[PDB]
PDB file of C-alpha atoms in Angstrom:
ATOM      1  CA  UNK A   1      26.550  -9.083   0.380  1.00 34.81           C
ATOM      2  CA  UNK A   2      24.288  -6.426  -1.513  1.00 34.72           C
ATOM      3  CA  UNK A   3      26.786  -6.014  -4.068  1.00 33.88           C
ATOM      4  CA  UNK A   4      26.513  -9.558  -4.684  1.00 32.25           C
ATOM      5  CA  UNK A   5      22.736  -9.590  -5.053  1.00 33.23           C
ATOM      6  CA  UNK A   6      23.066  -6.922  -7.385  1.00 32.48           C
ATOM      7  CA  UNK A   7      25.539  -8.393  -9.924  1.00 32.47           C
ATOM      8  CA  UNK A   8      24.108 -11.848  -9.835  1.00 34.40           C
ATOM      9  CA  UNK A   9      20.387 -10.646 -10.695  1.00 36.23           C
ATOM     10  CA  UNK A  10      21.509  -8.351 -13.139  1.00 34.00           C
ATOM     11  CA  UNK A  11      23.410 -11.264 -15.232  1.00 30.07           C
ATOM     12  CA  UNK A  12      20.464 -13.419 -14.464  1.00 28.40           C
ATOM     13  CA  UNK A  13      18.804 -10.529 -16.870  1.00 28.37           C
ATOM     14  CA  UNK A  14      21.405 -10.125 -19.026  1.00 31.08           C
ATOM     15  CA  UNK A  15      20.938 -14.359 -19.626  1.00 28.86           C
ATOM     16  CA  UNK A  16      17.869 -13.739 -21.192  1.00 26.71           C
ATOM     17  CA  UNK A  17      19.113 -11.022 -23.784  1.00 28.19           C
ATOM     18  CA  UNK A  18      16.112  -8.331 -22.591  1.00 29.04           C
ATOM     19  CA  UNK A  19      15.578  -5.445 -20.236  1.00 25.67           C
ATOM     20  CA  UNK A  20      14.207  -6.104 -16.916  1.00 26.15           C
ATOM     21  CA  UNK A  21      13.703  -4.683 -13.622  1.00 25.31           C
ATOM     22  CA  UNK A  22      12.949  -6.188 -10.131  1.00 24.91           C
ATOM     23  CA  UNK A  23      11.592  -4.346  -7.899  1.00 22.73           C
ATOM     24  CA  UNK A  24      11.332  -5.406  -3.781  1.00 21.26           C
ATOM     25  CA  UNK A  25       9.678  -3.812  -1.638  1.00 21.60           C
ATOM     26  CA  UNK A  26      10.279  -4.452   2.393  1.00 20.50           C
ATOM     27  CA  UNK A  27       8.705  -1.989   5.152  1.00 20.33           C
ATOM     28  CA  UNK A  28       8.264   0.992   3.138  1.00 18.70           C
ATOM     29  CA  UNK A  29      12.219  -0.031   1.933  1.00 15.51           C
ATOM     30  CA  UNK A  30      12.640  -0.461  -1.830  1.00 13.39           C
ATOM     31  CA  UNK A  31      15.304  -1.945  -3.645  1.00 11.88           C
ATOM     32  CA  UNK A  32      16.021  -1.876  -7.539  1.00 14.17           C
ATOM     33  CA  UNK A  33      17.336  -5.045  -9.309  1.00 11.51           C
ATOM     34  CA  UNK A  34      17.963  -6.536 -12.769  1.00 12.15           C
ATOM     35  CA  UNK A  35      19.639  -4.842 -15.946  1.00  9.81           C
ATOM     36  CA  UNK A  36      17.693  -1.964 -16.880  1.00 13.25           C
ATOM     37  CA  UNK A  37      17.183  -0.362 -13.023  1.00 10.28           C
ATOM     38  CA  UNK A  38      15.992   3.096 -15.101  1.00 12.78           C
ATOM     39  CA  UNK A  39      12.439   0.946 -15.807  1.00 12.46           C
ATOM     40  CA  UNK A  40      11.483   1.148 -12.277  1.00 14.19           C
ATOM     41  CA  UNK A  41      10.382   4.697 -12.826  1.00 13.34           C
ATOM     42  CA  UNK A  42       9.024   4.066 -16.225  1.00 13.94           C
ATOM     43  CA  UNK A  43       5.217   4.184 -17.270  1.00 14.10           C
ATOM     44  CA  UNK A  44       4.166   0.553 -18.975  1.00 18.11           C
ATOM     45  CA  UNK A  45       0.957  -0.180 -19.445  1.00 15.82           C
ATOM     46  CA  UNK A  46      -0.505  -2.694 -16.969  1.00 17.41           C
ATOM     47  CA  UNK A  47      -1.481  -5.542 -19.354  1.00 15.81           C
ATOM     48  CA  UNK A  48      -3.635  -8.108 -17.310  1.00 15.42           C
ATOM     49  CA  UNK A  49      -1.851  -7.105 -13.500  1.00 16.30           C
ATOM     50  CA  UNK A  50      -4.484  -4.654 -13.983  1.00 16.99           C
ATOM     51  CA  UNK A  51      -7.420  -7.830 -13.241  1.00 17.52           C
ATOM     52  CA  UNK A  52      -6.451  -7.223  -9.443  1.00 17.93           C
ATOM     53  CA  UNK A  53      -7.962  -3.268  -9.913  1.00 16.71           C
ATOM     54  CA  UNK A  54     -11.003  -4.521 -12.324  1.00 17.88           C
ATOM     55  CA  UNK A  55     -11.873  -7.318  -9.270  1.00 16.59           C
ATOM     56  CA  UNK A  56     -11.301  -4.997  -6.393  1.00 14.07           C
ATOM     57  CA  UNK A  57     -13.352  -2.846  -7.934  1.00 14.60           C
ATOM     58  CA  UNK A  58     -16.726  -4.920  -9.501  1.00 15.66           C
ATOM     59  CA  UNK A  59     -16.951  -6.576  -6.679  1.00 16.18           C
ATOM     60  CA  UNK A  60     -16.824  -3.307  -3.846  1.00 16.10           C
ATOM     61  CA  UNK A  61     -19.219  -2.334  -6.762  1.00 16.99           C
ATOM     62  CA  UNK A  62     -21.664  -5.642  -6.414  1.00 16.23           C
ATOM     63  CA  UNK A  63     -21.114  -6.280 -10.527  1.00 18.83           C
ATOM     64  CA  UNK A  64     -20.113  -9.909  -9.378  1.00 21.97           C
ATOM     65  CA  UNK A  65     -19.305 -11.915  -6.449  1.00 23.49           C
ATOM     66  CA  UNK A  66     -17.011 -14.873  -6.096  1.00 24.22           C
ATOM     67  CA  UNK A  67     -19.120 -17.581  -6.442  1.00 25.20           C
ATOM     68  CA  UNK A  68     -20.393 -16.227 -10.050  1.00 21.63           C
ATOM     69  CA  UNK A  69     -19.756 -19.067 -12.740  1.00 19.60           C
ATOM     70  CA  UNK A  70     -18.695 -16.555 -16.187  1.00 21.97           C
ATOM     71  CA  UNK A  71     -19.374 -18.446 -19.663  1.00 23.63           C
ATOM     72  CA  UNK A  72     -19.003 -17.962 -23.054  1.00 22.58           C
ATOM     73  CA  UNK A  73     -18.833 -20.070 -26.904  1.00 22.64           C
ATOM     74  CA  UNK A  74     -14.891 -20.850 -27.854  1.00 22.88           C
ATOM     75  CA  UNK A  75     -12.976 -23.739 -28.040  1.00 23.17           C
ATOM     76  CA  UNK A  76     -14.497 -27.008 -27.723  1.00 27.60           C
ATOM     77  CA  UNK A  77     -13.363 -28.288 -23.899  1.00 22.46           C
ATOM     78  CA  UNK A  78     -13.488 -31.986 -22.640  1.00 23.06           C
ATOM     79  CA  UNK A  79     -13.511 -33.701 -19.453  1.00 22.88           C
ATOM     80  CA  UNK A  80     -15.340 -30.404 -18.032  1.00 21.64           C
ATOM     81  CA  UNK A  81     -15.771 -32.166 -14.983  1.00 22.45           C
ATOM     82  CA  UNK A  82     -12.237 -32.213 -13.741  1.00 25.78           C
ATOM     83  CA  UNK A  83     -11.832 -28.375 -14.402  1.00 24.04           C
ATOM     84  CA  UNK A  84     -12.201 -25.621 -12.026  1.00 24.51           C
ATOM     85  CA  UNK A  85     -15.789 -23.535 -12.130  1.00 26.27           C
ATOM     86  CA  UNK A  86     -15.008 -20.502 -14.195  1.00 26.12           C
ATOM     87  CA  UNK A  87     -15.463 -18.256 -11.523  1.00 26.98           C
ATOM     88  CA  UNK A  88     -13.573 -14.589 -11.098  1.00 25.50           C
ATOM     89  CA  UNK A  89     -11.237 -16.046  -9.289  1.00 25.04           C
ATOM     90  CA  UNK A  90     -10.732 -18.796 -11.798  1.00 24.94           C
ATOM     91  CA  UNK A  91     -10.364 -16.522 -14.368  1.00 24.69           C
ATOM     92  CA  UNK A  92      -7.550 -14.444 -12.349  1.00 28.99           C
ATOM     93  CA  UNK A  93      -5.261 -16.955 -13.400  1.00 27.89           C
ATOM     94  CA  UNK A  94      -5.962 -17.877 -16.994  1.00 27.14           C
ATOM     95  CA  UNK A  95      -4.892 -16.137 -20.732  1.00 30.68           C
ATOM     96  CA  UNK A  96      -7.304 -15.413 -23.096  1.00 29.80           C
ATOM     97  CA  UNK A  97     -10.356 -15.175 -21.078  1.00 29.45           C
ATOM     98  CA  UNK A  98     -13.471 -12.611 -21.581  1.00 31.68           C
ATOM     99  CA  UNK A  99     -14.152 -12.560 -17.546  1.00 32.52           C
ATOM    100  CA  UNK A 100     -12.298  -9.714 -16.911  1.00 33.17           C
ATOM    101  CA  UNK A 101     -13.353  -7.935 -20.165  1.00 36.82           C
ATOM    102  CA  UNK A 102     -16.667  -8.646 -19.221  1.00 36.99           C
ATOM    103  CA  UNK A 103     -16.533  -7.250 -15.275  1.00 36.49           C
ATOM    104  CA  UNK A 104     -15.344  -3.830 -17.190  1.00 40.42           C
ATOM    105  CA  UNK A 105     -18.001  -3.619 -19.343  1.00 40.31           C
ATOM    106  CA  UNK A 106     -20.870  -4.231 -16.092  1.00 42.12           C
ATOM    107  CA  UNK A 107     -18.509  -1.745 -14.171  1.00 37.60           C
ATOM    108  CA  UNK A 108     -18.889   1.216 -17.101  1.00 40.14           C
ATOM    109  CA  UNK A 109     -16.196   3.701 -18.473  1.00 44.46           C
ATOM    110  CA  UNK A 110     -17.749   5.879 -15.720  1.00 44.16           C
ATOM    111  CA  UNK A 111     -17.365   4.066 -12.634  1.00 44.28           C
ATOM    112  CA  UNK A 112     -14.291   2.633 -14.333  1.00 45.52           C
ATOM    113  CA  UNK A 113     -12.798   6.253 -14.481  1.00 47.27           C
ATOM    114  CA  UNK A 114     -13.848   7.529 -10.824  1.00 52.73           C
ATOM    115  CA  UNK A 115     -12.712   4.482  -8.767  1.00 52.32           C
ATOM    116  CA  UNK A 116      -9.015   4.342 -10.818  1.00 53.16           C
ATOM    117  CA  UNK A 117      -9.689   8.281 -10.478  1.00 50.18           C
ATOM    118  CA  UNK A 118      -9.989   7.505  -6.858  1.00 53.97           C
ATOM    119  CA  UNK A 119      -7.603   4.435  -6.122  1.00 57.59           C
ATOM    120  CA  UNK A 120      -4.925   6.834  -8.171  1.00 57.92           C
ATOM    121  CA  UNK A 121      -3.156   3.840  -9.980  1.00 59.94           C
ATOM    122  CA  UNK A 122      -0.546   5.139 -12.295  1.00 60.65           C
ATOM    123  CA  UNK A 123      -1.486   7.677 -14.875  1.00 64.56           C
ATOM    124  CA  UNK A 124      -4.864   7.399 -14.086  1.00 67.13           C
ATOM    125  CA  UNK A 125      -6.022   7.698 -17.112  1.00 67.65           C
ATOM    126  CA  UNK A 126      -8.678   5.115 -19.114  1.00 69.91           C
ATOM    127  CA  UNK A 127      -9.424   6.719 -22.100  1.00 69.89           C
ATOM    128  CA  UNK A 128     -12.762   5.952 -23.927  1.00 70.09           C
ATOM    129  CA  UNK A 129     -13.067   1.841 -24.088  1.00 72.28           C
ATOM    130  CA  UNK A 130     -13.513   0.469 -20.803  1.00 70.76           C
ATOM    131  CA  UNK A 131     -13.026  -3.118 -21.894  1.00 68.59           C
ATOM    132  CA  UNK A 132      -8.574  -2.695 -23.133  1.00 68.38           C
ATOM    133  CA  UNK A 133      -7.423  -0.146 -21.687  1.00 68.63           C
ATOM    134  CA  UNK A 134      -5.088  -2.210 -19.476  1.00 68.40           C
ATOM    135  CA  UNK A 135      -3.423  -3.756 -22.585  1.00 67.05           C
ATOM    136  CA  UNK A 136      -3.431  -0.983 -25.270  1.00 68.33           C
ATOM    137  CA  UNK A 137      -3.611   2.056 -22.997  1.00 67.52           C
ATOM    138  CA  UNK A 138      -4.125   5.261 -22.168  1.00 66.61           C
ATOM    139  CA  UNK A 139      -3.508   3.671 -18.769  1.00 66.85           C
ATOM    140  CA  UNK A 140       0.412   3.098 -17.674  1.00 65.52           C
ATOM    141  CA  UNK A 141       1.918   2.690 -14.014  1.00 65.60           C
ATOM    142  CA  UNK A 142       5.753   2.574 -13.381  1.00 66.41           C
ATOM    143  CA  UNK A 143       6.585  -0.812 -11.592  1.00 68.42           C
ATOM    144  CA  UNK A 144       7.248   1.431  -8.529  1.00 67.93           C
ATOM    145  CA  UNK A 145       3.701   2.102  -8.437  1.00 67.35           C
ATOM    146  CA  UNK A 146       2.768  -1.669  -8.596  1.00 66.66           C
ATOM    147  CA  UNK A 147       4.687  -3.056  -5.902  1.00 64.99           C
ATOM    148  CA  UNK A 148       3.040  -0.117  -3.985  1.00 64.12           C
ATOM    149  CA  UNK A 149      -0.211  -1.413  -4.980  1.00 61.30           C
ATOM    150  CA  UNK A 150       0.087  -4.670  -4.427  1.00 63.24           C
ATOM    151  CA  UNK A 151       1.782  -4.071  -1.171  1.00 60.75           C
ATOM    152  CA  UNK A 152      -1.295  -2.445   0.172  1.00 60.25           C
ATOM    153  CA  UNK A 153      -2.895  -5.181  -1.012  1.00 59.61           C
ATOM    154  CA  UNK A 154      -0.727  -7.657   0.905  1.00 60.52           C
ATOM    155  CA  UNK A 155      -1.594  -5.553   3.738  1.00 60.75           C
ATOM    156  CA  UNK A 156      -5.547  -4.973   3.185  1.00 58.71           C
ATOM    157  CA  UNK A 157      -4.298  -0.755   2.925  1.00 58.61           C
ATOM    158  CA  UNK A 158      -5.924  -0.606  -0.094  1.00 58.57           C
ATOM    159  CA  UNK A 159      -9.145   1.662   0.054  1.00 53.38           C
ATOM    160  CA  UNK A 160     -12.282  -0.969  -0.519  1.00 51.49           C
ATOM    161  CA  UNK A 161     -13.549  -3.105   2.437  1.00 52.85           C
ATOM    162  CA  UNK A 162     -12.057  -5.680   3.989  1.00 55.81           C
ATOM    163  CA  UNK A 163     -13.616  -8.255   2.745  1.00 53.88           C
ATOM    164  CA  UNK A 164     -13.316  -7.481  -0.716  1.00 51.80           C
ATOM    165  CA  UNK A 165      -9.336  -7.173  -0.599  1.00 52.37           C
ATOM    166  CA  UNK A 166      -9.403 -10.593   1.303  1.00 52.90           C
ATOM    167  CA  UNK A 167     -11.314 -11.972  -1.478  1.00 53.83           C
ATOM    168  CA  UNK A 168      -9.152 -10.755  -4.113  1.00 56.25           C
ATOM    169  CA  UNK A 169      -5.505 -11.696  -2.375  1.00 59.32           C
ATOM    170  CA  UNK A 170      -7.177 -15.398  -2.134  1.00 58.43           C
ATOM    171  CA  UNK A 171      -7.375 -15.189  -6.100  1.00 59.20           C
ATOM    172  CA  UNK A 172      -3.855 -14.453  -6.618  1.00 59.98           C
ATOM    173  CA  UNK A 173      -2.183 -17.617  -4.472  1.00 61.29           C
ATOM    174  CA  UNK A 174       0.465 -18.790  -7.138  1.00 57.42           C
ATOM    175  CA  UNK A 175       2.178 -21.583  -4.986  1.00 59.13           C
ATOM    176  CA  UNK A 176       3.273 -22.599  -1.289  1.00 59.59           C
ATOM    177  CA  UNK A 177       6.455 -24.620  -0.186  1.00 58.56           C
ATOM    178  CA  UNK A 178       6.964 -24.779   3.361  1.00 55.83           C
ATOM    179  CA  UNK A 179       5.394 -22.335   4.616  1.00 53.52           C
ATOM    180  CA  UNK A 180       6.123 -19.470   1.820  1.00 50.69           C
ATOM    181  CA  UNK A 181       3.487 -18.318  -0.348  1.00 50.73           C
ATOM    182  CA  UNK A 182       3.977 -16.675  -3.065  1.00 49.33           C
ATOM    183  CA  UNK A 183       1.036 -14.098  -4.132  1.00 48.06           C
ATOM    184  CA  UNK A 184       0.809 -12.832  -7.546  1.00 51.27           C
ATOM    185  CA  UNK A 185      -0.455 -11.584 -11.134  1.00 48.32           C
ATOM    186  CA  UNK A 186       1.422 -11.929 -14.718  1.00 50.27           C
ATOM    187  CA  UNK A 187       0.947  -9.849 -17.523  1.00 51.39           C
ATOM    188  CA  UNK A 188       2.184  -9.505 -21.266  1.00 49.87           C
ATOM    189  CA  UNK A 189       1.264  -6.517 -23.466  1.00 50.69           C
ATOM    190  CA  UNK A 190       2.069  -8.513 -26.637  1.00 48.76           C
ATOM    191  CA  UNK A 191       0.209  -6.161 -29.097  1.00 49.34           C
ATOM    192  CA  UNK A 192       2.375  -2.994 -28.575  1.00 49.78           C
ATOM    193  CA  UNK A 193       5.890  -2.439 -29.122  1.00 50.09           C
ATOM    194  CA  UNK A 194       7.766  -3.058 -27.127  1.00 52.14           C
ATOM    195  CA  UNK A 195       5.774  -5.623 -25.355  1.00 52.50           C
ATOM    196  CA  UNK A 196       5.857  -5.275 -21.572  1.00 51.53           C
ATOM    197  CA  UNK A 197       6.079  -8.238 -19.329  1.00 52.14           C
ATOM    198  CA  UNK A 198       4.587  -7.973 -15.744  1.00 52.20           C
ATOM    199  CA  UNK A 199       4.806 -10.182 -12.598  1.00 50.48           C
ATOM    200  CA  UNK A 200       3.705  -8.011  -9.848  1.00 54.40           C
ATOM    201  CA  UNK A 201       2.839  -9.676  -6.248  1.00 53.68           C
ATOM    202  CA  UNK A 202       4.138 -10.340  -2.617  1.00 52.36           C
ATOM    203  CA  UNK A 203       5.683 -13.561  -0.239  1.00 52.60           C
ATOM    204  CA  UNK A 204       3.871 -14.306   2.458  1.00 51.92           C
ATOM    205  CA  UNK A 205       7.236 -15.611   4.157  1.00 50.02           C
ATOM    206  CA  UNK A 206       6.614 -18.660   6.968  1.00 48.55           C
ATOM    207  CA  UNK A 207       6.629 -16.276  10.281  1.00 46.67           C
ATOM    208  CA  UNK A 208       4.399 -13.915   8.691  1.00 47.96           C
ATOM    209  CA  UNK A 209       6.702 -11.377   7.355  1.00 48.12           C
ATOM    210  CA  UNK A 210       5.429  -9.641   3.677  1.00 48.39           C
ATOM    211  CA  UNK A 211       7.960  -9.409   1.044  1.00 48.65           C
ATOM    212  CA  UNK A 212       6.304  -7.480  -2.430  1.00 46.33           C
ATOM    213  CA  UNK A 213       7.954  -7.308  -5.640  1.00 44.73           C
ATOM    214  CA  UNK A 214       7.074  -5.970  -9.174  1.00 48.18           C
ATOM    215  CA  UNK A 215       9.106  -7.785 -12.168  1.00 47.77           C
ATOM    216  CA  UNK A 216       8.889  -5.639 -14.988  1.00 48.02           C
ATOM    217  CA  UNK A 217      10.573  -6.454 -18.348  1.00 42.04           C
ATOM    218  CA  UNK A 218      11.055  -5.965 -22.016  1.00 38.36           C
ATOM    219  CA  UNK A 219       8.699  -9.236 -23.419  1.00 38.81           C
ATOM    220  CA  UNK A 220       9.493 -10.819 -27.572  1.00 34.05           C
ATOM    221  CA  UNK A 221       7.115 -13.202 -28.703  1.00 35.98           C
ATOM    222  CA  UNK A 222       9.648 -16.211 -29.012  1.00 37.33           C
ATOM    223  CA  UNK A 223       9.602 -15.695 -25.136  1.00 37.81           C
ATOM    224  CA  UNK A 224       7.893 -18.629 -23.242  1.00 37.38           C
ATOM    225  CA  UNK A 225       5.046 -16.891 -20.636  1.00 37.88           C
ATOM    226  CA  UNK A 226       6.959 -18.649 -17.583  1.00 41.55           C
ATOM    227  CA  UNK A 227      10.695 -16.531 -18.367  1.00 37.33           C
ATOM    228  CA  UNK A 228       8.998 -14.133 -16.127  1.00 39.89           C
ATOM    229  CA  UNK A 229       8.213 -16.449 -13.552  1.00 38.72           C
ATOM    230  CA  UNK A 230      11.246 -18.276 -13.902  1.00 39.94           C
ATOM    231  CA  UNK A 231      13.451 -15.131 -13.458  1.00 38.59           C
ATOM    232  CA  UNK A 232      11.515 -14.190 -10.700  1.00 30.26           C
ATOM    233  CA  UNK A 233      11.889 -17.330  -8.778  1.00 29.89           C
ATOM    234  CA  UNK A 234      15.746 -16.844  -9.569  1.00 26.48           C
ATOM    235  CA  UNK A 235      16.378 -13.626  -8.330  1.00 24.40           C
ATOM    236  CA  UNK A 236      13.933 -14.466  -4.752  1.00 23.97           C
ATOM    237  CA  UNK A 237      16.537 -17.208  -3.952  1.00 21.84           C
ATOM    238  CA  UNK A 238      19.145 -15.010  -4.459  1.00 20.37           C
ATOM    239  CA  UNK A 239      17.723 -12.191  -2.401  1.00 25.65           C
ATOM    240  CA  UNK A 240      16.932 -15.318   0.576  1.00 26.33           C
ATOM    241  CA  UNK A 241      13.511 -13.964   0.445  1.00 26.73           C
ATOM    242  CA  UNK A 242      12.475 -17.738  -0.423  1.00 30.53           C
TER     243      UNK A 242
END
């Protein structure tokens, strides 16, 4: 049976002509998948899985709260009224937006620097622009690391209060089918080379039961944004973990 899982996931990889890793962790049990298992030990920077830290973080630090409405001048939207209020948790889920840039900046390099210091999340190290960091580095984390993380997470481990984790897991809710929910954060380094691709987050399976897993693969920019999710979604049938 595990034999199975492993050559099927690793073709599903090897489909998409890149390196990629799947990583699932089950009561303290991990398991490697994909084509290039040797990434699951391998610093990457976090690109924007990093927005779970940066909101954990501003609001334990009372920079924001959740019912903060974040604006700035860009493209010219219509029909305003049928979109979401740009709130934090808004902004968890969409490209491209200065939210998260912004909540870095209120936090400081200082505070920045302590709590990742403090929450020990990869390398640990931010460097001197608080606002990047997560896409250009210093800062990397192996994708072992981040299905730690975000397991805490799942399990409100993490070290900030109780309410604030609770606030942030509502944020990352990507979709529910009977019963299943599926938790969890993209991200794309596209400015460095290689470009890392990131989708980092946990099932909430229907009897309770917390599945985490940490996708971590080589990213080109012919790529469409939703390979990631689509190989994910792939390899969590396969596993029957949805």
């Amino acid at each position: 049976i595990v034999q199975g899982h492993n050559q099927v996931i690793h073709q599903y990889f090897d489909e998409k002509n890149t390196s990629g890793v799947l990583v699932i962790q089950t009561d303290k049990k991990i398991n490697l998948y994909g084509n290039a298992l040797s990434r699951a030990n391998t610093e990457y920077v976090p690109a924007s899985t990093f927005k779970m830290l940066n909101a954990l973080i501003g609001l334990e630090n009372q920079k924001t709260d959740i019912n903060e409405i974040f604006k700035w001048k860009g493209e010219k939207r219509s029909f305003t009224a049928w979109e979401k209020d740009m709130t934090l948790g808004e902004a968890m889920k969409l490209s491209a937006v200065p939210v998260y840039q912004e909540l870095a900046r209120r936090i400081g390099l200082d505070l920045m620097q302590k709590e990742v210091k403090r929450i020990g999340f990869g390398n640990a190290e931010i460097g001197q622009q608080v606002d990047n960091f997560w896409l250009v580095g210093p800062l990397k984390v192996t994708p072992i690391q981040e299905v730690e993380f975000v397991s805490q997470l799942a399990h409100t481990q993490l070290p900030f209060s109780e309410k604030v984790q609770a606030n942030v897991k509502n944020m990352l809710l990507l979709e529910e089918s009977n019963g299943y929910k599926i938790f969890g954060k993209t991200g794309w380094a596209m400015d460095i080379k290689p470009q890392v691709g990131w989708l980092t987050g946990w099932v909430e399976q229907p009897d309770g039961k917390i599945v985490a897993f940490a996708l971590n693969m080589e990213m080109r920019s012919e790529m469409p944004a939703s390979i990631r999710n689509e190989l994910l979604m792939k390899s969590l049938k396969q596993l029957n973990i949805i």
